[PDB]
Structures are given as C-alpha cells and as structure tokens.
Design a protein around this ligand. Structure first.
Ligand SMILES: [Cl-]
Length: 406
C-alpha cells in the first residue's frame, strides 16, 4: 500500500507513531530483503511532553500532518534524538518551526552534528546535551536515564530508559527492517531472518562498540525495547538479546579482520562502505568500521594493528579528499605492514581525485590490492550495491587464501 502512520498506545503516557513504508525507498544494503520498514517515533506525555525521533525526509509531511491532529505542538517540551543526520534534520526543521518552545535532547556528538546540519537554518531551539547516567524527569515516574551508545555509523547514538514503563528506547539497536501490521513482535520465526540481516548489515562492522553498548544497557531491567525500525521488542526481547551476544561473539572470534576506513557516516560513499563490509562479513571475515570524521588516532592505530587488510572509502571535496581521510592516510601509512591487503573506493560528482590520490599513495607505498579500485559516479543503484558486496567478498576470499598459506 501507500506510506502511512500507525498509532498505538504502548504503555502509560506512552504512544508509538510508526511511519510505515511497504516499499524499499533507498538503495542501501540493509533494505536488501525488500520487506519494507518502519520509522518509529515515541511520545511520552506526562507532566512534560517528549517526542522521540521524528522520522526522516520520506515521512516528514505525513508525520507532521498526523501528529498535529493528536497534539498541540506548542505544548511539546522536548524532542529527544536517538541519532542525527541530514535526513532526520530535514524533518526537525519543520517540527521545530511549529514547536519553537521545545528543547532538543541528544548526545554530545549528535549536538555537534546538529549544529553543523542546522547551521544555516533559522531554528534556534536550545540543545541540552545528555551524557551517561544523566536524567530528565517528565513527571509521573518517567525519570529518564540516558545511555550514549556510539558506533562509527551512529557517533551520536543515544539510548534512553524509562523506569516507569520499563521501556528501553534503543534507536538503531535491536530493530528490523520489516513493515507489518503488528505493532509488537509476537512470534519468533517470522522476524528471525530480518533481525539477523539487520544485525549483519548494521552492527557486525561495529562489533566491539555494540558489545560495549549492550553491556551498559544490561544495567536497566527493561521489559520492552523500543527501536527505530520494525515492531516493538517485547516477546522476543530475551531471545534476541541472547542472539546478539552470540553473534557479537562470533564476529570478534573470526580469524581475519579488515579495517574499513570511510570518510563519514552519511552519504553516497558511506552507502558503498556498508555494502563492501557486508560482502566481507558474510564471507566469514570480521570488519572494524572506522568513521574517519569522528574516530581518533588510537582507534585507527589499533584497527590497523589487528587487521589483515584495510580499505579506504572517500568522496572528493574541492578536488581533494576530506581532511579526515588525509590524516587517517598518514596514520595508516605510518603503521600498516606492507603485507596488509589494500582496497580503495568512493563516489564522486564529476571529479574523483580523492580516489586517484589514495590508489596512487597505496600503490607507491608497496601495497597489493584486494579488488580493483571502485569508482561510483553519482547515486548508487541496486547493482552498485551488489557489485560492492561482491568486491567485499572477493577481498575476503583473497585474505583467506593468503592466510591459509601462513
Ligand atoms: Cl548519530
């Protein structure tokens, strides 16, 4: 059917707004099963009123249109963001126009992101940054506790626990890209493949950070996960959590590892990066994703120190690689053994000099390449993703073949 908004009360003072699409809307590897998805927003309306995670650009108008019929936006006290990017920021611009009195609640990395993203926008709602174990009291027992859960792809990711309802708002964790009529997740098997595919595409390349996240979240006795995507997790909560632990364990246990350094979390190059990573991990080789923009030097050193191969992904900005790609390049060259397998990819408009620069520097530095350098002009398509995935697989096979020779 057409996109819609499914509304359901889910706990005291708490409502979910599921923006639903039955069709795939973006060419990103995680929508590969083409089972649709949902973008979930949550409203806690107590003494104070908080809205979690307005949906992105595809959903902006249905969502705001629907919300306004259920709520005077002038009474909105808080907008809580589990993660931030330009797509979500688009909806925020409109929502905050209608709710100028609201305060933005988010993590420190998200705040930094949002300040750039809304730099030229008129909206100037205040931002209140939340750190681990900070609280926000909505009244009526809804004293929220916040838990930062950063990953390369979601540097500003922030989970929230509501002790009144025992709901953990988990953002990108524990979800599934599947559109259905069920607001809750009764039935294990129908969601198993979606949940595993979701983990594999989104979380496997961040196995250590995701494990660190789940360790923190253990401290909260939640009976429901309220994720960004798919049904709420109530009936499958324990089983899915045990599965995540096992999957995380097997990722970090794999013999070979690839350091996958890409320029930033969101954008065409990032889309390519997730596709390549999935090709590697499905082939039984671990991936440590590195967001050059938000990563520090020790992260990059440690990744390169334990990897069998590394891959750079970069856009071209004014004829050059982004500064974070240039500095990551220096750290990589200063630390990588020439036995490491190398790879280069990227997207570009009409100039792709960043890709040429990287290919040349790695070739001059004596590295062998694990796939032919990937150059994608303008927006990735379905076959783009499959090609990148296949390149990742090729890279993985090359690593396994060379390792078997010891
Ligand atoms: Cl984020």
């Amino acid at each position: 059917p057409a996109k819609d908004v499914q509304i359901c009360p889910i706990a005291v003072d708490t409502t979910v707004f599921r923006s639903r699409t039955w069709d795939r809307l973006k060419f990103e590897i995680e929508y590969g099963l083409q089972r649709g998805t949902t973008a979930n927003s949550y409203l806690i309306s107590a003494d104070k009123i908080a809205l979690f995670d307005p949906p992105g650009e595809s959903f902006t108008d249905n969502f705001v249109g629907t919300l306004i019929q259920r709520l005077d936006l002038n009474s909105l006290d808080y907008v809580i963001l589990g993660h931030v990017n330009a797509n979500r920021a688009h909806t925020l611009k409109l929502l905050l126009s209608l709710a100028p009195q609201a305060t933005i609640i988010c993590s420190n990395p998200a705040a930094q992101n949002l300040e750039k993203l809304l730099a030229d926008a008129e909206v100037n709602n205040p931002i209140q940054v939340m750190k681990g174990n900070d609280h926000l009291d909505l009244g009526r027992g809804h004293e929220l506790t916040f838990i930062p859960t950063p990953s390369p792809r979601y540097p500003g990711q922030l989970c929230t626990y509501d002790p009144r309802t025992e709901i953990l708002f988990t953002d990108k964790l524990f979800g599934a890209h599947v559109c259905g009529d069920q607001v809750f997740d009764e039935g294990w098997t129908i969601y198993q493949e979606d949940r595993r595919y979701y983990f594999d595409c989104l979380l496997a390349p961040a196995a250590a950070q995701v494990s660190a996240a789940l360790n923190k979240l253990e401290a909260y006795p939640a009976q429901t996960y309220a994720p960004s995507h798919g049904p709420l997790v109530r009936y499958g909560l324990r089983e899915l959590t045990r599965n995540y632990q096992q999957w995380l364990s097997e990722q970090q246990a794999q013999a070979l590892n690839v350091a996958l350094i890409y320029a930033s979390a969101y954008g065409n190059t990032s889309t390519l990066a997730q596709a390549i990573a999935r090709g590697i991990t499905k082939a039984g080789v671990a991936v440590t994703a590195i967001n050059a923009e938000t990563s520090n030097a020790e992260e990059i050193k440690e990744a390169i120190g334990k990897s069998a191969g590394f891959i750079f992904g970069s856009p071209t900005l004014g004829g050059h690689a982004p500064t974070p790609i240039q500095t990551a390049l220096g750290i990589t060259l200063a630390n990588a053994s020439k036995t490491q397998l190398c790879g280069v990819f990227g997207s570009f408009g009409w100039s792709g000099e960043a890709i040429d620069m990287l290919e040349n520097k790695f070739r001059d530095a004596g590295f062998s390449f694990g796939f032919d350098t990937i150059r994608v002009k303008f927006k990735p398509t379905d076959q783009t993703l499959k090609m990148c995935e296949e390149a990742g697989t090729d890279f993985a096979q090359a690593l396994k073949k060379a390792e078997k020779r010891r």
